[PDB]
Scaffold this active site. Structure first.
Site, short mmCIF file in Angstrom:
data_model
loop_
_atom_site.label_atom_id
_atom_site.label_comp_id
_atom_site.label_asym_id
_atom_site.label_seq_id
_atom_site.Cartn_x
_atom_site.Cartn_y
_atom_site.Cartn_z
N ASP C 56 28.64 43.40 31.78
CA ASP C 56 29.91 43.96 31.34
C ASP C 56 29.82 45.16 30.42
OD1 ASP C 56 32.74 44.07 31.02
OD2 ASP C 56 32.49 43.05 29.09
N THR C 89 35.58 48.83 33.23
CA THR C 89 35.16 49.22 31.89
C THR C 89 34.02 50.21 31.98
OG1 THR C 89 33.78 47.25 31.87
CG2 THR C 89 35.88 47.16 30.70
N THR C 90 33.01 49.88 32.78
CA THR C 90 31.87 50.76 32.97
C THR C 90 32.28 52.03 33.72
OG1 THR C 90 30.26 48.96 32.94
CG2 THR C 90 29.61 50.98 34.05
N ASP C 385 37.12 38.16 33.86
CA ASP C 385 37.47 39.33 34.65
C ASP C 385 38.22 38.96 35.93
OD1 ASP C 385 36.40 41.52 33.10
OD2 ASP C 385 34.38 40.83 33.67
#
Lengths: 518, 518, 518
Positions: C56, C89-90, C385
């Site tokens: 994550d 997010t990444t 998630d």
């Protein structure tokens, strides 16, 4: 497991690449602000407090104490450029920086380094072909051209205020010294002396068809001026000779004390007497001159200087025609040189000997004058490049426009060439072509011009009008460098692209940096 | 009980083995990324700040300051490869790393070390027979073959950009210098000098069928060019000789002060006269040359050089045919050598002497040019390997295909040899065969190809089309290496397996490490 | 002149940008390797030896101790993305970094940052419109697609080994607690509890249509299992109450020492007695439970739990239907909730209460089982998630393909958009479009595929077949993501672009960094 010593640092792959390229980019970014007619100068102070003010790229990189190895390598580029072509040192470092910058975009796109490296080697080779082709072949001897090369060189440097004069002095000196052989010239820059003395103004500098030695007339009774001087050059000290084989006098009677003092006296006199008989009225001795000797030279009305530098003896020989003789004994009239005037003269206080008016000197001297020591030092540098750049032309017989014109043509041509080869190499090639635009780009930048607008104007204007279109930074608009007289040697651009390319391709291949602890 | 000194470290069994093999594996993993025509280089900065950018395995391992002893062990492999065969330094270390890696799998399976060692020795000996048997015998001076060998050598290095030129120079230099005795060729690489000098581009490098001495004409009035030069080589200094036994002149009368000076005067002159009488017009003196001597030598119009290195004196003889004489007095016309042209010349500023155009020189000079110090430095290394690979073939007369072809051949057969001996040695033998594939694997790995798939395709095609099949990194596809000229010396692969094996076995026999505090 | 305090650091112009951008790019290159089906994980160990193993992006950046201000600013991108869409997010951080890389290229061209900034905003606003258009609308409750969303969310993580089971649990849980006010769904992720207990494998994880509590049945003689439980939810502690106003008992006769003691007993008995009267057979008390009260609950055969966590009381209410009462006095039958089975069980040796079989639970629990604590922690994150992306699609009928298909669509369309804007903004809009490719690029990159080749095939195909064409890293080639069932919420991409975009523009606007000495 502990393999490398604690203290050793290491970067591999992209880290090694990111680092090495950046160091190079930053060094180039440091000297680029110096480039061009509106580029400024750098003030450098070493650890001992010595101060160096100059616009010269090589000097800068040399005097500044760099750390990062990649940055040190760029220094090699500027140093070699300087020795081979004189000017173009900042140009090569700057181009080298940009090549790397453009290569990292590819490196980031994951193009294998070998491909980038191969593409560049292709572009580099092709750039030399184009240069040899679009260069303007000229009369190795043409003074008008040699003057534009000189003046163009002496621009954007502290000394630019008096470039008309300095250019003139620089061209004349090289012409004289230049040796003709096979319709092709060769210039030995050692035949041109650079004597500097603060005082007066730079506008007072001059070319002495002879030599200016920073020495003095050994004896006060000797003449300080000799008109149609017959110069004798000896490097054997005028003194009592002693054998190489150990030897010692064995006094056995009181009369010998005298007989031997007199014998030495006679030897010393005969030397001076011998000189006189050649008809020489001026003698330069590489080594010492005993007082007795000086006394006889004085009584003979012969002017004499002693302990003259080895290199100074050589210049005098080439200027005056005189032939250096090892032993006084072998001195003959056929060994005397000629000079219209040889006289002691004071400059900014200090006395100095002037050997001027030589018939056809093979060695010449440029006397540099100026307001302060720092000023004459940066003039001497400006003059050093001017001389070398004039030299490049007389030896190459090839010249090019400046103002970025060459770099612009190259960028157009090499890009088209890229299309020809295609593949991933075509990406490296078009990137090489692109990188070349920093020269024109940096010229406008240092001039405080809008970089984006200018490139747009010169490239198109150049594409339309031709090879000589470059940037006239003074008028801030594209212009024909050829008509403007803005010209530089072919060698400057040739060596510049060679050193930068090879350096870039070398750095670009490094995927592992291992530095120990200092 | 305290048997060993405080600070002493010790490891036994698996620990001793685990660490030793790890250091070696890592040292191997470090140089593998340099392997092949797609491999990259390393920049090494020592404790003083001197920079070394190269691709050569031996240089890397030698310049790096290794700590772990097992790592120091690997340095020995690369070094020996380099002396013996030139190319193949990296692959030898890589194979050694791999061998130990595969061996540990057996150690873990609890196979006694003496058995693993025995299997490797059996395998290594069998490998030599196989290499000798598949080796492609060719005739010693086949220029085409030699050019492929040198070109193959030069690839994957900085210079590759100019490998056609560099290969040509390497080959020509070796062919000329080589001596044939009994249908056999022997080459002494000392008859091939490498002179470096930054400026121009690597593309400007040349082969001088003579010698390039980095010195200058001692006297300014001497000629700077002599056409059909009659060369004299003397090592005795042209100065006033003194006896070995101590001596001192005992002066007793004033007339002597002069008589002895003139005697030394005469001695100096007589020497020069003797030289002139032989017909000589160019002389290289190993020791010094007195001013008086230079003066007479000059008047004779004889070019002279003082303090010439002994090694350069020897190659001037080999080249020009001249015979080095000790005493001037023993010099004869039959002692003079020939050179079509001998002349001083400036390169990037610094003067130099060219003795070019010799008849059938026995020593030659490869003059290297380049954009920077570091570039010509790497070029020199590449030229060094190239020359030694060319030597290997002229002396061995055998060559093998590259691209991992030999290793794939070895891997197949050796694996079949395993099946033959069987038992546990069979495990060690089949592992030795497996280990050999890092070479083709690494070639693909450094080229960015899929190791697993490439490996499958080569072994497969190799089995169908035979020996020649290896990997074509530039096409990401297997290929007939012999057809594409991708060829290398038999010695390169033989010496590699030899050193890789013995080192791996030596390390593998170690079950106890005892290190004292430093 | 000393304006700032010693130790203060300041960077300006290109330096401020170089630094800020290099920082942002590095932090992005760092988390970048975790992106996609073949993205890997990081192990983060803080100063207290605490270990975190995730994939994550938000978790990574939040746990790493970052020094650079620019780096700290990317964390906000990752954090804001996680709060709004869960996944991406990444992606958001990786894009923001690329966006800055592509922008410095323009900065080097001397394109005023104002222009780069305006151009990026146009590209961003345009991107949002394009996303809203290409977005595929679906039924918020369509289980079929809901599971595809969850399954793609989970792949590329440690828990992917069981993406079928886990996706089923996530989709099931969110669907159950989800509320459809008016043809529109809204979901409170607080109604979905996550319980972890090391033991068994991740395969034993399950969905409890009720609540699981890490507590025990307070008294030994109390039932450990209750069939059709009538749950009572009390807030006040079952203890002798006291007035808010200070009070004290003033005793005056011995008979009182006992009457006041018996009165406090009676008070406790009445409370319990009252509860019992409602018919409740299970009671969760948020506060304490006096030993005497426990004794009575036991006698009545009522199973009770004390000190229940507030948030659990609410989940119990939402699940069981029970109404939470403040004072035992106000508890009535209409307040009791229902659970088909309330039982105490041991998990990994620890006792826990299970409330399952609830009618129409509005609060639900996902029990996570696993091999180790770390495995369980990472599955919990993987689920957090899945739960959130599913939530996104139930509140937004929008969905999109993944595999870089959206970013590819945007790169194609935004490039077109540039043309209709023109000028320098066009350049900026093109770079924003180009930047968007690191997603597909790094997806292939992490898979080991060839970035350059992939990019060409994907875009080519995408242009041919349409919106759904993306990279199938597992099969190593372009493919239809919609058919393959690889889809993500519209929100994931919309937020990502915004956060990335607004942060990039903010950083590009900086030209002066002033940091106080820490």
């Amino acid at each position: 497991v502990v393999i490398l010593p604690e203290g050793t640092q290491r970067y591999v792959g992209r880290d090694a690449q990111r680092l090495n390229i950046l160091a190079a980019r930053i060094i180039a970014e440091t000297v680029r602000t110096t480039l061009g007619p509106k580029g400024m100068d750098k003030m450098l102070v070493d650890s001992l407090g010595d101060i160096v003010v100059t616009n010269d790229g090589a000097t800068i990189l040399d005097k500044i104490d760099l750390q990062h190895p990649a940055a040190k390598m760029m220094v090699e580029v500027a140093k070699t450029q300087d020795k081979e072509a004189g000017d173009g040192t900042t140009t090569a470092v700057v181009i080298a920086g940009e090549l790397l910058r453009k290569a990292e975009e590819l490196l980031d796109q994951n193009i294998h380094p070998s491909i980038i490296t191969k593409g560049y080697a292709l572009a580099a080779e092709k750039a030399q072909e184009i240069l040899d082709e679009i260069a303007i072949r000229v009369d190795p001897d043409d003074e008008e051209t040699l003057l534009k090369i000189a003046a163009t060189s002496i621009t954007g440097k502290n000394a630019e205020s008096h470039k008309e004069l300095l250019a003139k002095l620089a061209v004349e000196a090289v012409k004289q010294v230049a040796e003709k052989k096979d319709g092709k010239y060769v210039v030995d820059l050692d035949n041109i002396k650079f004597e500097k003395k603060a005082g007066e103004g730079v506008e007072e500098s001059e070319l002495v068809r002879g030599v200016v030695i920073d020495k003095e007339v050994v004896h006060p009774r000797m003449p300080k001026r000799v008109e149609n001087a017959k110069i004798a050059l000896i490097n054997e000290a005028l003194e009592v000779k002693k054998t190489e084989t150990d030897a010692k006098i064995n006094i056995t009677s009181p009369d010998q004390l005298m007989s031997f003092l007199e014998q030495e006296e006679k030897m010393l006199k005969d030397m001076v007497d011998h000189i006189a008989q050649t008809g020489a009225n001026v003698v330069f001795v590489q080594k010492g001159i005993d007082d007795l000797a000086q006394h006889y030279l004085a009584k003979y009305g012969i002017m004499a200087v002693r302990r003259v530098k080895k290199s100074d003896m050589e210049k005098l020989a080439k200027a005056t025609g005189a032939k250096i003789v090892t032993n006084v004994k072998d001195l003959t009239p056929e060994d005397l040189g000629y000079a219209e005037v040889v006289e002691e003269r004071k400059l900014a206080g200090e006395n100095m000997i002037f050997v001027e008016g030589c018939k056809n000197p093979k060695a010449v001297t440029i006397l540099i004058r100026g307001g302060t020591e720092h000023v004459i030092d940066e003039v001497e540098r400006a003059l050093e490049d001017a001389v070398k750049v004039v030299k490049d032309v007389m030896e190459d017989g090839a010249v090019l426009p400046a103002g970025g014109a060459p770099e612009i043509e190259l960028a157009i041509r090499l890009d088209e060439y890229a299309k020809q080869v295609g593949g991933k190499e075509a990406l490296a090639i078009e990137n090489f072509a692109d990188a070349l635009k920093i020269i024109p780009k940096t010229l406008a930048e240092n001039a405080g011009l809008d970089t984006v607008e200018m490139l747009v104007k010169v490239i198109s204007e150049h594409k339309n009008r031709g090879l000589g279109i470059g940037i006239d930074v003074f008028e801030g608009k594209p212009a024909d460098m050829l008509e403007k007289g803005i010209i530089e040697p072919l060698r400057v651009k040739k060596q510049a692209i060679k050193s930068a390319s090879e350096a870039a391709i070398m750095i670009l291949r490094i995927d592992d940096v291992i530095a120990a602890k200092a």
